[PDB]
Ligand binder design. Structure first.
Ligand SMILES: [Cl-]
Ligand SMILES: [Zn+2]
Ligand SMILES: [Zn+2]
Ligand SMILES: [Zn+2]
Ligand SMILES: [Zn+2]
Lengths: 29, 29, 29
């Protein structure tokens, strides 16, 4: 249970950072 | 408390995916 | 530590709200 949550959490953090860069690129272009 | 962490993670995973869907629709649309 | 997970989830939720806010301002720009 713990491991399943932490792994899902790390993946969501990586996605979060990627979407922040994507939104900035969308605004900036 | 653990159930609340699971529920928060699931709701944020869905929020995360919904935002990704709009960003991908707009950047290739 | 469960507080470490709580903190990471809170930071992701704040990032999620910040990106949604900026995307909404962009789309309505
Ligand atoms: Cl706590
Ligand atoms: Zn794309
Ligand atoms: Zn709107
Ligand atoms: Zn829209
Ligand atoms: Zn409007």
């Amino acid at each position: 249970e713990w491991e399943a949550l932490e792994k899902k959490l790390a993946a969501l953090e990586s996605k979060x950072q990627a979407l922040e860069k994507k939104l900035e690129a969308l605004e900036h272009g």
